[PDB]
Amino acid sequence: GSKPFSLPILTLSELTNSRFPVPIDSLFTAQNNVLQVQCQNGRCTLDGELQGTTQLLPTGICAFRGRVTAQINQRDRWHMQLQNLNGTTYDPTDDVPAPLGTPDFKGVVFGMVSQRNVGNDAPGSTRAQQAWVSTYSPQFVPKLGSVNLRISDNDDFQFQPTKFTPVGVNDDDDGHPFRQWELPNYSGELTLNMNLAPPVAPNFPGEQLLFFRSFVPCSGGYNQGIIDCLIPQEWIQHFYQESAPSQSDVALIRYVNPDTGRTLFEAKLHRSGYITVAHSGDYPLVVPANGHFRFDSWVNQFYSLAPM
Ligand X SMILES: C[C@@H]1O[C@@H](O[C@H]2[C@H](O[C@H]3[C@H](O)[C@@H](O)[C@@H](O)O[C@@H]3CO)O[C@H](CO)[C@H](O)[C@@H]2O)[C@@H](O)[C@H](O)[C@@H]1O
Query: Which listed residue (31, 33, 74, 125) binds its own copies by CB under 8 A?
Result: 125
Burial 13-46 (b: 16+ CB within 10 A, else e): eebbbbbbbbbbbebbbbeeeeeebbbbbbbbbb
By CB under 6 A, tell whether 156 contacts ligand X: yes
Cα separation of 76 and 151, whole Å?
9
User: Which listed option, its own copies, Mg ion, ligand X, none, makes contact with residue 116 (CB within 5 to 8 Å by class)?
Assistant: its own copies
Cα separation of 258 and 255, whole Å?
9
Cα separation of 277 and 284, whole Å?
13
Query: Which listed residue (3, 6, 59, 304) binds Mg ion by CB under 5 A?
Result: 6
Task: Quote the least distance from Cβ 31 to its own copies, whole Å.
Answer: 22
User: Which listed option, Mg ion, its own copies, ligand X, none, makes contact with residue 173 (CB within 5 to 8 Å by class)?
Assistant: ligand X
Task: Quote the least distance from Cβ 91 to its own copies, whole Å.
Answer: 15
Cα separation of 181 and 40, whole Å?
10
Distances (CA, A) of 18 to 84, 96, 151, 174, 197: 18, 17, 26, 28, 14
Cα separation of 84 and 201, whole Å?
31
- Contact set for its own copies, span 204-233 (CB under 8 A): 215, 217-225
Burial 82-98 (b: 16+ CB within 10 A, else e): bbbbeeeebeeeeebbb
User: Which listed option, its own copies, ligand X, Mg ion, none, makes contact with residue 294 (CB within 5 to 8 Å by class)?
Assistant: Mg ion
Task: Quote the least distance from Cβ 85 to ligand X, whole Å.
Answer: 23
Task: Quote the least distance from Cβ 244 to Mg ion, whole Å.
Answer: 10
Q: Per-residue contact track with its own copies, 90 to 119, x per CB under 8 A?
A: --------------------xxx-x-x---
105, 180 contact by CB (below 8 A): yes
Residue among 86 and 297 whose Cβ is closer to its own copies: 86
Residues lying near its own copies in the complex (CB under 8 A) are found at 8-10, 13-14, 16, 21-23, 56-60, 85-88, 110-112, 114, 116, 124-130, 163, 165, 167-168, 215, 217-225, 234, 237-238, 241, 289
